[PDB]
Design a protein around this ligand. Sequence first.
Ligand SMILES: O=c1ccn([C@@H]2O[C@H](COP(=O)(O)OP(=O)(O)O)[C@@H](O)[C@H]2O)c(=O)[nH]1
Length: 397
Amino acid sequence: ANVLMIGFPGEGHINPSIGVMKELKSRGENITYYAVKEYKEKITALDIEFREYHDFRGDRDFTEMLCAFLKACKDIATHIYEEVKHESYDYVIYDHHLLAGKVIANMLKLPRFSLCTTFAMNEEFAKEMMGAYMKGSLEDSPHYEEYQQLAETLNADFQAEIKKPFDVFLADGDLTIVFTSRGFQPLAEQFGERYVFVGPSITERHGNNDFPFDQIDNENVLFISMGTTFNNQKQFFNQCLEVCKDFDGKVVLSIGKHIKTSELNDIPENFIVRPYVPQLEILKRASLFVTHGGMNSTSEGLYFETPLVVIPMGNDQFVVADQVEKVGAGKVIKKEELSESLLKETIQEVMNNRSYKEKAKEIGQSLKAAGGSKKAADSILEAVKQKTQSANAALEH
Ligand SMILES: O=c1ccn([C@@H]2O[C@H](COP(=O)(O)OP(=O)(O)O)[C@@H](O)[C@H]2O)c(=O)[nH]1
């Protein structure tokens, strides 16, 4: 079948969608993936028709974020529809957090599926998990009346079916694939059968082979990454250089793309410091993961039964951090308590710790049991089959 896929601008969005595209393609499907230019190689790598839309990141108040996401919906929906209108697609997949995806699905009159790369969210989750506060009342919010104008226009002119603010950021398809298990998902019981909890979507990405695996293959490996988004971090990597310099093995520091490695302090002789690592392959070989608590890093780590130390900074990280504390699989350091000493003690406590390893194994196994990129494909293709046979029953007119 012909599949329109519309991604969201961020690596933690794109990465889990790779497994599902790769599973769908190896089953006969031709895919057209829309993303921002940054992540092209990640899609070209799969041998999948790549296409672009304006990166709206390069251009925290709740009502402003609603309006930015509606401006972008309108631009993406217009741009993408202009290009796809004459093409023959059988269904659309899109990032749960990209409303334009649901709008494209409505303009093509096709079956659609959302991929949720965070925990599943309903009205019982705080705005703060999507990285927004309100100072006081919604009325006195600066973009309040703008939100009411744009939502209204997108409903009338774009079939955006926005009944509620949260519908801007949580765009349910006919199904919502969620990349966690009901086990790990807080308030799992509040999500019906249209939420398919498939756990993490793990498969070889391309770019991996450059890293020297032979240096870490028969060694203890401490892996550290604060993600792909939380910079302001040169301070923290400097602290990692001092805390871990006498580690008895290899320390793999992924510092991200906005900090030159020469801008840090002296690298000890036992460190491999890169802007980007093949995280899946590093986790395969890692004893311990010091992570920011990003949904994907956290659930990639547990998938490899890696005990964690989680230093959460923003967005959903507090909620995922707390889920790691809850299931026994790791230990959280609050930013306010972060110090070289407490970083060193926390790593020494969790390294090789029988109790953290057991609990990491349990939740790791809950997450694998959810069926992964494979389950995402069975569930989607089966929904498509039923709606095709349903709609293909135009043998009355
Ligand atoms: O050096 C790195 C750093 C990050 N990642 C990937 O980037 C994504 C980060 O998503 P997460 O939800 O953990 O954090 P965010 O960066 O979105 O805060 C994950 O799939 C990681 O495997 C990677 O491959 N190599």
